[PDB]
Amino acid sequence: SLHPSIPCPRGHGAQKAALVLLSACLVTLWGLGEPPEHTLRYLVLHLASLQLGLLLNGVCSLAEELRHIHSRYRGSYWRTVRACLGCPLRRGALLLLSIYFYYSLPPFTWMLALLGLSQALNILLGLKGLAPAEISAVCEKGNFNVAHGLAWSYYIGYLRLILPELQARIRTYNQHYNNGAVSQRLYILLPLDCGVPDNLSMADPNIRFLDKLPQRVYSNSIYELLENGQRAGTCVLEYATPLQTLFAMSQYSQAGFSREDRLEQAKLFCRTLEDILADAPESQNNCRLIAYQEPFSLSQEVLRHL
Amino acid sequence: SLHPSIPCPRGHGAQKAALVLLSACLVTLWGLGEPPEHTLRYLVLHLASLQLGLLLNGVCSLAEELRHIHSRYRGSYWRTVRACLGCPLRRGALLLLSIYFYYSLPNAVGPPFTWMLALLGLSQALNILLGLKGLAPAEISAVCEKGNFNVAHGLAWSYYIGYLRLILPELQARIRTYNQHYNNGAVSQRLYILLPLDCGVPDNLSMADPNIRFLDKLPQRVYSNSIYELLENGQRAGTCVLEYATPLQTLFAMSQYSQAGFSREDRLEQAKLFCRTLEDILADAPESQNNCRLIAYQEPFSLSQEVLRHL
Amino acid sequence: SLHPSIPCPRGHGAQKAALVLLSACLVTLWGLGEPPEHTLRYLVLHLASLQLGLLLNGVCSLAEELRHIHSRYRGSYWRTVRACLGCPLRRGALLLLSIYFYYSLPNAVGPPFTWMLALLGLSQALNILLGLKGLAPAEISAVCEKGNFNVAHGLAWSYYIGYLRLILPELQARIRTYNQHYNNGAVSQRLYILLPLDCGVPDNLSMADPNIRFLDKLPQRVYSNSIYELLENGQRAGTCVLEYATPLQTLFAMSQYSQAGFSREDRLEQAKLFCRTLEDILADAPESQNNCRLIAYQEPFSLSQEVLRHL
Amino acid sequence: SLHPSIPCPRGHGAQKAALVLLSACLVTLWGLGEPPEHTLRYLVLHLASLQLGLLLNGVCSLAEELRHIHSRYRGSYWRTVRACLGCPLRRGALLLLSIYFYYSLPPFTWMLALLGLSQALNILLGLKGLAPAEISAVCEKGNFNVAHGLAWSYYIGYLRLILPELQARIRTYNQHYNNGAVSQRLYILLPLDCGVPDNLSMADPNIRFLDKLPQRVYSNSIYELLENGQRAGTCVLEYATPLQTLFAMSQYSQAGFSREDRLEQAKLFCRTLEDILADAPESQNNCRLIAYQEPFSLSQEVLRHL
Amino acid sequence: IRFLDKLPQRVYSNSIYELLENGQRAGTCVLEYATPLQTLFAMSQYSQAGFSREDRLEQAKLF
Ligand SMILES: CCn1nc(C)cc1C(=O)Nc1nc2cc(C(N)=O)cc(OC)c2n1C/C=C/Cn1c(NC(=O)c2cc(C)nn2CC)nc2cc(C(N)=O)cc(OCCCN3CCOCC3)c21
Ligand SMILES: CCn1nc(C)cc1C(=O)Nc1nc2cc(C(N)=O)cc(OC)c2n1C/C=C/Cn1c(NC(=O)c2cc(C)nn2CC)nc2cc(C(N)=O)cc(OCCCN3CCOCC3)c21
Ligand SMILES: CC1(C)C(=O)N(Cc2c(F)cccc2Cl)c2cc(C(=O)NCc3c(F)cc(F)cc3F)ccc21
Ligand SMILES: CC1(C)C(=O)N(Cc2c(F)cccc2Cl)c2cc(C(=O)NCc3c(F)cc(F)cc3F)ccc21
């Protein structure tokens, strides 16, 4: 609802389509007309190599982690083992389960040399790479995103400090003058393009700076929303200052934060600001978000919510 | 370098294990003396299952992304496949290799290719639903650090682009102006940014330790800064412009709220990571040309002892 | 899109067509009917032949590099090895597989390892001596433009960082001031930078075409800007702040000298590329907030028309 | 002559040691003791595959240039073929020479298809990549290096315009102020780490600003060189600005310019500026370059040149 | 009257002024106050000069 080009939280399409594929997959195994004794042996041995390979992958990971004991895991060996190999208990059972069934199921020592060699090629040539559309899912589900830190810093830092003392300063400026009364809500502008001009008239000339709201120290502007050369309304406009910071990351070569990522993350920052302003006690319909990506009259969009 | 506890950027110990492992792999293959020809096919066939799996897994992962395409992938089909399947042309060739390496190759162990198609699909769904192929927390922190997906990365950079970048150019002159109009000791020209690893950031700096006491407000948008003196044994041991790290404070309040999904285990990592990233940004930035020095520690001891040794 | 002559950055057509040839080549492998056991073995063996040769060639490449360690590689040997042999931990992971797949695998065609190693160095030595395995310019041009190995990339970024990033913020203010204090048409608020692709840069802009002539130097680290009137049919259709691009002059003078090793055709290659690099830089820079305009033309026509059509 | 850290112009350590490596490897062929016709045909077939290897790489690259033909090659198919395949006839003649040797020397059509397929995997996967050592071994030879541009333009634009009239301005300044004449040479500092403060005082307090030389407008500042609290030299100091641009080039992400390249090109920029000023009419011992790198006394570095 | 620029250059610096009229530029000439009149005013300001206001006015006219 915030904007047609803001991504919704990831749903369960992967779960549902897999279920449909799983339903259709189990159908076609029955069509072969073959006993499932081989199928069960194949499936168990198919999983056995993965668990065996996962151990060596953890072991290969651990050799980097062995010198990391004093750095990340409080100088503890057991915690380091858990990080690479997952839960030691559940993983440990799978290791012994595979070995016992592998010997029973009809070489013995040749596969480990080959499987250990195969795990090397995944580590060395990077065949088992992470698809970014699965990097995004895990990063978003675990809240490993840069935007999730830019929004929470904004809310805890700026919004949660002026929102209580905003409607009061709006009311006082309304009585102290006579003007069309200014709206009692802050209309945060969230330019999705992350190009934030230092003056509002630069984005559109029909929006003009009129006055500064009386006042830790904060300064806000009231803008003369002009339609057909006449005032149609007034409000307090304010760009999201993180949207500059996300932009100025993309310029710098040290950020490792490219243009495709800049737009991709800045989409989250607005989404994870609505999810914050929805439940925040300081938000009592006293702050209204407006987003717009230039394909546009900025003045009408402010009027659109008015 | 900043502290014995701050993690170092990952080395190449991963492939170091693999190369040593491969050294123990070729010898083991040579020691057992297996038929070399079938050893070649088996490794390829094994990699034929692995790379054909990344398509069945990808397509299931692709199903959801076809509904974000208008917003997340700017309404383009080719920016949907490249996110779920890596580079398409590079990945597309490997599939034709794996298909060719499985369509008609002799295979003592393994089903025919048309049989293996069904067995692969059933295997992928089981791993997806149960999460058997779960990401290890060691690799989660490894990939995110490499691709810069950690939340402390932004909080370190935003603390630079917003505040640190805008005040270091004038901080030397502002400190110089105060010293020339004050006592004949003197205040150091280097800013100090406290980075308590515990993220315990008292509102008043003097309350952390009695030896550090607020002296004066440094003269000048209001960029207020309070200069502090370090009272060691009742005498003016040293004075410097000291402040806490606001992003660490915002991290501390981040973990408290339950709408952030920020456990205290994660906050400790980002408390450490935010220091190293701030070390990296200030290492080469033109503004931080020996203009700022960072203080990081973990409270188990006096804070004044650590700041004094830096002067 | 500035001019039809300027080239676009290299695409992925080479990878795209290679997929088609891979697809058609798969048909012939399935049509002739040779056993896949030998086809898989040869293909691994053939790929083994190419990879194993790169070792000695890299060794001969490293041979000159042993004395460059003190100068071009900061005194570390392992940085030198990666420079010549590619990734040390990956290429060695491919040589070892080819060593195992040639010391053990059957070799229906080709010498044994004890024999191939003799011939392997011989072919590379001849290629090094005679330069037979040479890089055609399209391979060099691709590496030059992908890895930013050009002199135009140098000039464009220098031109922006040194000149265009320092007057564009202050260009709008002076144009507004000049328009405000004088009431005789109006001057556009944009600098219409002229980019003559032929690198013909006269000192006097009015001499280029009669319709352009000097009006008044624009009042203001002492930047001299001359605005011009565009006499169309003897009528001042419009006036603008107009100037040439100095680097495109310094590309011309580079080709004149015989010490630069910068041929006439190379000048054209690094002149078209330079203009594209400037647009890619201005279109993303914050300073060019609709503040600068590019006018690129290759002389086959009046200069005033294109300047006018952009107004 | 300039600095130990400056890379020397590429000698011939390859041919010096490759031939020696060949000489040791030329003895071993006589050691094996094998028939010569068998050896002869293998080598010919080896070069026959490479000719097709070069043919397929160029032809695949030719498919891309059908979009750049009207831009890079002036709409002429001849330059399109020449850039990709090298010489249209010399390369073409080798192929049929190789093919005729291919069939003459002891399947045929299936071998050609396999060779084409194996070249496709070379292109898509990119195993046969260009090593960084040979990337900087061709660009240096072909003068396709970024710092070469920032060097010559710094000459045609700045050095060639101020050097002829510098000594006159120094002579005028030396006459006007008596007692401690300045050196008649322009000292262009070249800090190889590219750390260029706006003023020399921040780099080292032992160097003092003295005055600005009389004068478009050219401003050169004369700097005092102090030693143990007393003057030791006076000369015109001016950082090579392209080093500052090179340092700021690596800062921005759109430059595609790494940190090592900054260090690598800064080393190159002095050496190509050495070559220009070695054989230039505007160099009459009136301009001596200073290059240094902290692994220090910058102030004492200048005195060694005096 | 608007300041325009400084005349090109012991060194002597002089100023050229815009002579605005009805909002348009109508003339350009070098305007430079007679500093001795400023000196006379400062003389009348201080009490050690023994130099009254009418004295300053009359000396301005004679100057
Ligand atoms: C982006 C920098 N950054 N990233 C992280 C992570 C931490 C910091 C950081 O260090 N910021 C900070 N600390 C300061 C300390 C002093 C001082 N001691 O004098 C002075 C400063 O500059 C004025 C300080 N600044 C910068 C300005 C900051 C707060 N602020 C913001 N929000 C952000 O910038 C922002 C972006 C993101 C992402 N998250 N945030 C929230 C912090 N919008 C504002 C609009 C107005 C206006 N229209 O007038 C006035 C503001 O502040 C004046 C009042 C200062 N108050 C409040 C804070 O505490 C000190 C006293 C505004
Ligand atoms: C081509 C020479 N070159 N190649 C490389 C690589 C680096 C340099 C170089 O550094 N040259 C330089 N250094 C100077 C220092 C002084 C001084 N007083 O110290 C005086 C000079 O002469 C005026 C200086 N010059 C020459 C002219 C320089 C600057 N300038 C340019 N630049 C380019 O065209 C150009 C080409 C390439 C390639 N990259 N660039 C961007 C730098 N265009 C201009 C147009 C106008 C006008 N229309 O009026 C006015 C200019 O000068 C006013 C600005 C003076 N500022 C500049 C920097 O800060 C201090 C002084 C212009
Ligand atoms: C490295 C080595 C020797 C190995 O250890 N395995 C594990 C394994 C089995 F998978 C199957 C049986 C025995 C073993 Cl022992 C393996 C498999 C193949 C292969 O082609 N598997 C096809 C395949 C399946 F059989 C089932 C499935 F669900 C998917 C699938 F894609 C090639 C080489 C190996
Ligand atoms: C694709 C196919 C069938 C092909 O066309 N050739 C060309 C060719 C020769 F190069 C050599 C002989 C016959 C043919 Cl017929 C080839 C070669 C190999 C191979 O293993 N070459 C090893 C190898 C050498 F023989 C000489 C050398 F100096 C180094 C070296 F590394 C594998 C498959 C093929």
> For residue E40, what are its two tokens?
């006379």
> For residue C11, what are its two tokens?
């695409």
> For residue A76, what are its two tokens?
């503890």
What is d(CA B121, CA A134) in angstroms, rounded to the nearest whole number? 18
Which chains, if any, share at least 3 CB pairs under 8 A with chain A? Answer: B, C, D
Pick A197's closest partner by Cβ from C89, C284, C289: C289
Ligand 4 nearest-atom number relative to CA D42? 12
Residue B223 counted as an annotated binding residue = yes
Binding residues of E: 10-13, 35
Residues 6+ apart with CB under 8 A from C107: C45
Measured between alpha carbons, how far apart are the two ends of chain B, in Å? Answer: 17
A197 within 8 A of A151, measured Cβ to Cβ: no
Output the residue whose Cα is nearest ligand 1's atom 57. A216
- Say yes or no for a CB contact (<8 Å) between D14 and C64: yes
In a 3-state reduction of DSSP, which class is residue E63? coil
C294 within 8 A of C282, measured Cβ to Cβ: yes
Full DSSP string of A32-87: G---HHHHHHHHHHHHHHHHHHHHHHHHHHHHHHHTTTTTTSTT-HHHHHHHHHS-
In eight-state DSSP terms, residue B268 is: H
C224 within 8 A of C183, measured Cβ to Cβ: no
In a 3-state reduction of DSSP, which class is residue B168? helix
What is d(CA B28, CA A108) in angstroms, rounded to the nearest whole number? 13
Full DSSP string of chain A: ---TTSPPPP-SHHHHHHHHHHHHHHHHHGGG---HHHHHHHHHHHHHHHHHHHHHHHHHHHHHHHTTTTTTSTT-HHHHHHHHHS-HHHHHHHHHHHHHHHHH----HHHHHHHHHHHHHHHHH--SPPPHHHHHHHHHHTT--SHHHHHHHHIIIIIHHHSTTTHHHHHHHHHH----PPPSSEEEEEETT----SSHHHH-TTEEEEEE--------EEEEEEETTEEEEEEEEEE-THHHHHHHHHHBSSS---HHHHHHHHHHHHHHHHHHHTT-TT-SS-EEEEEE-----HHHHHHHH-
| Per-residue burial over A271-299, b = 16 or more CB atoms within 10 Å of its CB, e = otherwise | bbbbbbbeebeebeebbbbbbbbeeeebb
Q: Specify the long-range contacts of residues D194-198, CB closer than 8 Å, at least 24 apart.
A: D194/D243, D194/D244, D194/D246, D194/D247, D194/D262, D194/D263, D194/D266, D195/B289, D195/D247, D196/D239, D196/D243, D196/D244, D196/D247, D197/B289
Which chains, if any, share at least 3 CB pairs under 8 A with chain B? Answer: A, C, D
* Among B45, B23, B145, residue whose Cα is nearest residue B99: B45
- Say yes or no for a CB contact (<8 Å) between A202 and C289: yes
Size of interface C-E (CB pairs under 8 A): 7
- Say yes or no for a CB contact (<8 Å) between D117 and C85: no
- Say yes or no for a CB contact (<8 Å) between A254 and D255: no
Neighbours of C255 (CB within 10 A): 19
What is d(CA A46, CA B127) in angstroms, rounded to the nearest whole number? 12
- Out of A49, A110, A112, mutate this one to test ligand 3's pocket (max ligand atoms within 8 Å of CB): namely A49
How big is the CA angle at A112 (ends A110 and A116), to the nearest 5 degrees? Answer: 125
Neighbours of B307 (CB within 10 A): 24
- Chain C positions in Cβ-Cβ contact with residue B41 (cut-off 8 Å): 37, 40
B124 within 8 A of B105, measured Cβ to Cβ: no
Scan for tokens 């389960």, then name that residue: A97
| Per-residue burial over A42-62, b = 16 or more CB atoms within 10 Å of its CB, e = otherwise | beebbbbbbbbbbbbbbbbbb
Neighbours of A193 (CB within 10 A): 13
Q: In whole angstroms, how far apart are CA A140 and each of A133, B29, B50, B78?
A: 11, 43, 26, 22
The crossing angle, in degrees rounded to 10, of helices B246-256 and B264-284 is: 160
- Say yes or no for a CB contact (<8 Å) between B26 and C93: no
In single-letter form, the type of residue at position B106 comes to P
Full DSSP string of chain C: ---TTSPPPP-SHHHHHHHHHHHHHHHHHHHH---HHHHHHHHHHHHHHHHHHHHHHHHHHHHHHTTSTTTTSTT-HHHHHHHHHS-HHHHHHHHHHHHHHHHTS--SSS--HHHHHHHHHHHHHHHHHH--S---HHHHHHHHHHTT--HHHHHHHHHIIIIIHHHHHHHHHHHHHHHHT-----EEEEEEEEEETT----S-SGGG-TTEEEEEEEP-----EEEEEEEETTEEEEEEEEEE-HHHHHHHHHHHSSSS---HHHHHHHHHHHHHHHHHHHTT-SS-SS-EEEEEE-----HHHHHHHH-
What is d(CA D149, CA C149) in angstroms, rounded to the nearest whole number? 10
In eight-state DSSP terms, residue B163 is: I
What is d(CA C170, CA C187) in angstroms, rounded to the nearest whole number? 15
Pick B36's closest partner by Cβ from C23, C26, C105: C105
How big is the CA angle at D222 (ends D246 and D282), to the nearest 5 degrees? Answer: 65
In chain A, the residue whose alpha carbon lies closest to the alpha carbon of D253 is A253
- Chain C positions in Cβ-Cβ contact with residue B36 (cut-off 8 Å): 100-101, 104-106
Phi/psi zone of residue D200: left (φ > 0), alpha (ψ -120 to 50 degrees), beta? Answer: alpha
What is d(CA D126, CA C91) in angstroms, rounded to the nearest whole number? 12
Question: Where are the alpha helices (H) located in chain B, listed in sequence order?
Answer: 13-32, 36-65, 78-84, 88-103, 113-130, 137-147, 151-158, 165-180, 246-256, 264-284, 303-310
Give strand pairing partners of E16.
E5, E30
Give strand pairing partners of B294.
B193
Query: β-strands A230-239, A186-191: how paired?
Result: parallel
Method: cryo-EM
Nearest ligand to the CA atom of D38: 4
In eight-state DSSP terms, residue B67 is: T
In single-letter form, the type of residue at position B22 comes to L
Neighbours of D238 (CB within 10 A): 16
> For residue A258, what are its two tokens?
């490219």
Measured between alpha carbons, how far apart are the two ends of chain C, in Å? Answer: 17
B128 within 8 A of B134, measured Cβ to Cβ: no
- Chain A positions in Cβ-Cβ contact with residue B17 (cut-off 8 Å): 59-64, 123
Query: β-strands D221-227, C235-244: how paired?
Result: unpaired
Residue D259 counted as an annotated binding residue = no
- Chain D positions in Cβ-Cβ contact with residue B89 (cut-off 8 Å): 124
Handedness of CA B32, B38, B39, B43 (dihedral sign): negative
Q: Is the CB of D46 under 6 A from ligand 4?
A: yes
In single-letter form, the type of residue at position D237 comes to L
